[PDB]
């Protein structure tokens, strides 16, 4: 039962300007997802400072990334707190209608994409790499939800067939063909150590 939503405009004017636009210096793509795996790492954990059974679904607190030459994806992988139903649908979007206005009120005025971050749409730079973006995730308090789009103004979300995964998000990042260096470990390594070398939990690089 696959459900199918059309993005607010705003946001499908964004992953426009993402796709489309020259913009050599894709890799902050990355920064800004292991940035929101934090985020919702740092959200569970405090939480559960105050309900300590918000950890029966996993109590290890961690990224992954975990690339594939041969289905030619790059995944990040956190046990954060996760997106309900209400987050994929409505939620993210009225955030995010604010956060791309900002974010494109100061493209001119000459601020770059780099800072996409700051306006609370770093998720979005994944369509600076990926033709595809898959996103698997869980919340204690809603069941397990895949959400997907290749963008063209619409995403489609329905409940996950796949493996349970206690609690967390699964970005999936199918990559366009002109992108597969960010399937490389030396590569991936590079981003990592350069970005990212000081966020607060163990990020592991699986290998193949
Ligand atoms: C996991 O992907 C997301 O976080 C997401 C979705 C599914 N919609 N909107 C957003 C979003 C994130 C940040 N700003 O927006
Ligand atoms: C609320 S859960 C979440 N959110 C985002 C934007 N990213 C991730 N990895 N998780
Ligand atoms: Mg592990």
Same mark, same amino acid.
């Given at each position: 039962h696959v459900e199918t939503f059309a993005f607010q405009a705003e946001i499908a004017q964004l992953m426009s300007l993402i796709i489309n636009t020259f913009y050599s210096n894709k890799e902050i793509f990355l920064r800004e997802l292991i940035s929101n795996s934090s985020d919702a790492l740092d959200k569970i954990r405090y939480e559960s400072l105050t309900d300590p059974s918000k950890l029966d679904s996993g109590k290890e607190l961690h990224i992954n990334l975990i690339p594939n030459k041969q289905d030619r994806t790059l995944t990040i992988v956190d046990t954060g707190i996760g997106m309900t139903k209400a987050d994929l649908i409505n939620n993210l979007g009225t955030i995010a209608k604010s956060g791309t206005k900002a974010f494109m009120e100061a493209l001119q005025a000459g601020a770059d994409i780099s800072m996409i971050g700051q306006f609370g749409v770093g998720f979005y730079s994944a369509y600076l790499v990926a033709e595809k973006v898959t996103v698997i995730?869980?919340?204690?308090?809603?069941?397990?939800?895949?959400?997907?789009?290749?963008?063209? *103004?619409?995403? %489609?979300?329905?409940?996950?067939?796949?493996?349970?995964? *206690?609690?967390? %998000?699964k970005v999936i990042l199918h990559l366009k063909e002109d992108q597969t260096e960010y399937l490389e470990e030396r590569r991936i390594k590079e981003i990592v150590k350069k970005h990212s070398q000081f966020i607060g939990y163990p990020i592991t690089l699986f290998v193949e």
């Open positions: 995730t869980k919340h204690n308090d809603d069941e397990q939800y895949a959400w997907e789009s290749s963008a063209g *103004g619409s995403f %489609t979300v329905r409940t996950d067939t796949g493996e349970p995964m *206690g609690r967390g %998000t």
